[PDB]
Design an enzyme around this catalytic site. Structure first.
Site, PDB file in Angstrom:
ATOM      1  N   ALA A   1       0.848  -1.218   0.000  1.00 57.20           N
ATOM      2  CA  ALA A   1       0.000   0.000   0.000  1.00 57.20           C
ATOM      3  C   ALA A   1       0.873   1.254   0.000  1.00 57.20           C
ATOM      4  O   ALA A   1       1.911   1.249   0.690  1.00 57.20           O
ATOM      5  CB  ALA A   1      -0.922  -0.016   1.193  1.00 57.20           C
ATOM      6  N   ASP A   2       0.455   2.294  -0.728  1.00 54.62           N
ATOM      7  CA  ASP A   2       1.227   3.564  -0.798  1.00 54.62           C
ATOM      8  C   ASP A   2       0.703   4.578   0.217  1.00 54.62           C
ATOM      9  O   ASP A   2       0.499   4.202   1.392  1.00 54.62           O
ATOM     10  CB  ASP A   2       1.116   4.204  -2.166  1.00 54.62           C
ATOM     11  CG  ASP A   2      -0.284   4.228  -2.760  1.00 54.62           C
ATOM     12  OD1 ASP A   2      -0.859   3.137  -2.940  1.00 54.62           O
ATOM     13  OD2 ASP A   2      -0.783   5.337  -3.037  1.00 54.62           O
ATOM     14  N   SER A   3       0.496   5.820  -0.226  1.00 52.06           N
ATOM     15  CA  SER A   3      -0.061   6.867   0.663  1.00 52.06           C
ATOM     16  C   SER A   3      -1.526   7.114   0.294  1.00 52.06           C
ATOM     17  O   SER A   3      -2.339   7.317   1.205  1.00 52.06           O
ATOM     18  CB  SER A   3       0.772   8.121   0.543  1.00 52.06           C
ATOM     19  OG  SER A   3       0.529   8.703  -0.753  1.00 52.06           O
ATOM     20  N   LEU A   4      -1.847   7.074  -0.998  1.00 51.52           N
ATOM     21  CA  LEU A   4      -3.252   7.270  -1.435  1.00 51.52           C
ATOM     22  C   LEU A   4      -3.973   5.925  -1.372  1.00 51.52           C
ATOM     23  O   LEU A   4      -4.889   5.718  -2.189  1.00 51.52           O
ATOM     24  CB  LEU A   4      -3.350   7.856  -2.837  1.00 51.52           C
ATOM     25  CG  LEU A   4      -4.363   8.989  -3.010  1.00 51.52           C
ATOM     26  CD1 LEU A   4      -3.949   9.876  -4.162  1.00 51.52           C
ATOM     27  CD2 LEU A   4      -5.770   8.461  -3.216  1.00 51.52           C
TER      28      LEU A   4
END
Lengths: 33, 394, 55, 55, 55, 85, 49, 97, 49
Positions: free
Chosen positions: F38-41
């Site tokens: 998972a990233d930030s968005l």
């Protein structure tokens, strides 16, 4: 260890861990209610 | 000192004595099946040292008669001597034969006309073994019935709540129970000079249809290995025949599973030795019996060895605690209740296949003679033990 | 009286177990069957070590 | 009760129902009927006589 | 009771059953046999009373 | 008041698993959110899914400092704790 | 003592209290209409009642 | 709790019953019930535990629910071992506190 | 009381673990109690006397 070997009924009964003396207090009124 | 009696025992009297010791152990401990050790030592204040006549269970044992466990053990021994090795279909047919004769049945009462007739054998069988060895007769397959059983004997379902399995009722009788480890002394004696992996293949073949689990196979393997070890040995080597020797030899080569190794190590480093017991009323109330019972309660759950690991660990404790006194060991094993027939029968099998023949007291021989089994059954046992001393085809 | 009774019962243990075994099966007995069962198991003629400990 | 205890090897509440009865009788042995040796003969300075059930 | 018994001649058991249906009361489900404790205790009670009386 | 952190933790783990596509026994109670795919968005989408599953509102500052599924479960347990008062 | 004479009321029959299985069956049927979770181990719940 | 007396409920807001049941009084109840259940587990042939709980109906006591079998002693038998085990289990809570 | 104190003393770890579980769950079942107690190494009693 074997702390339960040195348990004495005359001199006082106490576990190994040091006296969980946590307490706080409001006044008698805020304690009753 | 230790058991001396005769000199070094041979290799035929060893086998016949193993079968005889299994016989006397099962017959002596049969009436005390499923009760705690304090209850047993309070009903028998003078020691559990003679054949009980008066039994009031639901399926009462009669005087001088063994249970299904020794039936399966001896049938395994005979059928093995017939096919000269562990062949599954042969001994499974022999087992269903021993489970078939003399029996009877009862009918049902169901609204729609449902019919689940109850077959009652002529002896006492564990409910799981009863179920599996009557499913064999139910027509279904012999190899994949364990998979129906593990998920059938699952009446435990959720057992929502309800903590300890204290009641032998809520204990796990299934593919990992003691059924396999109870009949692996004669097998392990037929293979005393065959190699460990061949021995393992044999004991695995004898289990395929009922105990496919790994821990049940481990229990069977350790008991068979102990049988073979004491078979190769001689009761005179005051260095080769020591409990530490057998226990370490078990720990290194055979014991592979985790909990089995843990129980074996625990038994090893806390092992002690009882002195010779002549007055049982004073022994049943002393520091020694108490220490032994404390270790026994460590090795099991509330004094009930249902899983094969607990079973085998308890079996070694009763035998290794009386090193040099086989009758005393079988008495101590019968005095612990629980699965007393199986425990004491295995301890007796091993005491026989190690020490031989000259240790069975005359009173137990006479009791086997005077029971319902009689001379017929007694010398059938001695003959199936004689026709085992040399069979090695394949 | 308690000592007298307990001295009676701790001599006829075989007879008491014969009676319990018989009564567990049929759940009923008549005094004559009970009498003959008890007769089949007379008391010990002498006292060994275990008998002395029980007494 | 003493038979249950000598069979099981352990006390029970069965004794609880025995001794109660016996105690009544034992008192009636000592006080009212005068069978004991309480005094040199068995005559005692106090007894409790029953009332009729009519009351 | 006797005519349900497939017979006609009154036996001791039959008159005994009649006395008991009025002196004691109606029959009730038997004692459980799953554990040894209940029947062992009650049968030991009965056989102790009977054996001590006979002695 | 008295909240059962066990159930909350179980269901937070289930929601994270179902959201990312990773099997439930892989998401450890201390596994951070960038290492699990998972990233930030996407840590905000699982925040939204958490609110949607429990039907509560996440405090925003406490949501700026979420890094372990344990702290997420603890924030949610603290929210559900103070509901009637 | 009147209505007990022979012919009037000659047979008394005794109905015991239910057991684990009896209670299990009893509670299974009184719930067919109510809203109930399917995975209820009725036997275990009857063991503690 | 009857005409007056009382002093056992814990959630009424009146001068008797504090509203959140202070935490030092929850640690104690948990220690009590834990000691009682622990002793009832390690005792051979005691009843079986079905559900342990603390603060039922907000009262300041625990509640352990015991499943027992009506066919080991058919509503009538009490042996000595059982009574001694019960005594130990009933003192365990105070002793652990 | 001596037996109760001795058996709580030799089982200190299991006692504290079960206390924490009760403090943070409120309720607990017999299977969970068994699992918690056996995970911390309880030392059973030999007899009830």
């Amino acid at each position: 260890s074997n702390w339960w070997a040195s348990i004495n009924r005359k001199t006082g009964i106490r576990g190994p861990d040091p006296a969980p003396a946590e307490e706080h207090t409001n006044g008698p009124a805020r304690d009753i209610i | 000192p230790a058991w001396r009696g005769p000199g070094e025992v041979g290799d035929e009297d060893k086998a016949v004595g193993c079968l005889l010791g299994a016989a006397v152990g099962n017959v002596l401990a049969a009436p005390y099946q499923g009760d705690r050790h304090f209850e047993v030592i309070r009903l028998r204040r003078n020691g559990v040292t003679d054949f009980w006549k008066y039994d009031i269970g639901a399926q009462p044992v009669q005087y001088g008669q063994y249970t299904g466990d020794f039936a399966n053990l001896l049938a395994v021994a005979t059928s093995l001597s017939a096919s000269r090795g562990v062949e599954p279909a042969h001994l499974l047919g022999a087992l269903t034969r021993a489970y078939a004769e003399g029996g009877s049945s009862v009918e049902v009462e169901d609204a729609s006309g449902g019919s689940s007739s109850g077959f009652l054998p002529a002896r006492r069988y564990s409910p799981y073994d009863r179920l599996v060895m009557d499913a064999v007769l139910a027509g279904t397959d012999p190899l994949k019935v364990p998979e129906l059983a593990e998920r059938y004997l699952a009446e435990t379902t959720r057992r929502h709540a309800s903590s300890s399995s204290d009641r032998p009722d809520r204990e796990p009788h299934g593919p990992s129970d003691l059924g396999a480890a109870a009949r692996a002394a004669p097998i392990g004696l037929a293979y005393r000079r065959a190699g460990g992996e061949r021995l393992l293949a044999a004991v695995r073949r004898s289990l395929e249809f009922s105990h496919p689990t790994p821990l049940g196979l481990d229990a069977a393997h350790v008991v068979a290995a102990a049988a073979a070890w004491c078979g190769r040995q001689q009761p005179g080597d005051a260095v080769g025949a020591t409990p530490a020797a057998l226990l370490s030899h078990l720990l290194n080569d055979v014991a592979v599973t985790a909990e089995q190794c843990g129980k074996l190590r625990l038994l090893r480093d806390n092992l002690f030795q009882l002195d010779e017991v002549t007055d049982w009323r004073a022994f049943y109330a002393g520091p020694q019996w108490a220490r032994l019972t404390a270790l026994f309660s460590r090795l099991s759950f509330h004094g009930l060895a249902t899983a094969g690991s607990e079973f085998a660990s308890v079996v070694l404790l009763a035998l290794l605690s009386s090193w040099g006194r086989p009758e005393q060991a079988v008495i101590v094993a019968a005095s612990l209740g629980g699965h007393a027939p199986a425990t004491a029968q295995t301890v007796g099998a091993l005491a026989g296949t190690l020490y031989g023949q000259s240790w069975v007291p005359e009173r137990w021989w006479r009791g086997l003679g005077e029971g319902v089994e009689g001379e017929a059954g007694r010398e059938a046992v001695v003959q199936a033990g004689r026709a085992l001393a040399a069979v090695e085809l394949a | 009286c308690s000592e007298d009774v307990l001295g009676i019962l701790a001599e006829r243990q075989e007879a008491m177990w014969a009676g319990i075994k018989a009564l567990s099966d049929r759940k009923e007995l008549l005094g004559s069957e009970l009498r003959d069962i008890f007769d089949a198991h007379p008391a010990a003629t002498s006292r060994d070590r275990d008998a002395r400990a029980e007494l | 009760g003493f038979a249950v205890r000598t069979a099981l090897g352990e006390e029970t509440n069965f004794t609880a129902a025995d001794i109660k009865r016996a105690t009544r009788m034992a008192k009636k042995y000592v006080f009212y009927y005068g069978f004991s040796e309480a005094g040199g003969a068995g005559i005692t300075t106090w007894a409790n006589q029953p009332y009729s059930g009519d009351f | 009771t006797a005519v349900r018994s497939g017979r006609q001649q009154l036996t001791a058991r039959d008159i005994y059953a009649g006395v008991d249906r009025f002196t004691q009361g109606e029959v009730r489900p038997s004692l459980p046999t799953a554990h040894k404790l209940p029947v062992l205790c009650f049968a030991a009670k009965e056989i102790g009373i009977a054996l001590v009386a006979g002695e | 008041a008295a909240v059962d952190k066990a159930k909350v933790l179980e269901d937070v783990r289930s929601i994270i698993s179902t959201q990312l596509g990773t099997e439930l026994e892989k998401v450890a109670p201390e596994a951070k959110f960038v290492d699990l795919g998972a990233d930030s968005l996407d840590t905000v989408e699982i925040m939204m899914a958490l609110e949607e599953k429990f039907e509560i509102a996440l405090e925003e500052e406490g949501a700026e400092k979420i890094a372990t599924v344990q702290d997420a479960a603890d924030m949610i347990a603290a929210q559900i704790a103070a509901k009637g008062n | 003592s009147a209505l007990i004479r022979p012919g009037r009321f000659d047979r008394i029959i005794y109905m015991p209290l239910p057991d684990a299985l009896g209670r299990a069956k009893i509670m299974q049927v009184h719930a067919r209409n109510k809203a109930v979770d399917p995975n209820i181990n009725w036997y275990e719940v009857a063991r503690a009642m | 709790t009857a005409g007056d007396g009382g002093g056992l409920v814990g959630g009424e807001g009146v001068e008797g019953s504090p509203d959140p049941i202070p935490p030092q009084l929850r640690r104690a109840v948990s220690v009590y019930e834990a000691g009682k259940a622990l002793l009832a587990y390690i005792t051979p042939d005691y009843e079986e535990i079905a559900r342990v709980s603390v603060c039922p109906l907000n009262v300041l006591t625990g509640f352990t629910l015991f499943v027992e079998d009506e066919d080991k002693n058919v509503n009538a038998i009490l042996t000595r071992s059982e009574l001694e085990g019960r005594m130990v289990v009933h003192l365990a809570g105070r002793c652990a506190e | 009381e001596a037996k109760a104190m001795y058996g709580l003393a030799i089982n200190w770890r299991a006692l504290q673990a079960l206390t924490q579980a009760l403090l943070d769950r409120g309720t607990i079942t017999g299977k969970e109690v068994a699992h918690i107690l056996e995970s911390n190494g309880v030392i059973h009693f030999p007899d009830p006397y």
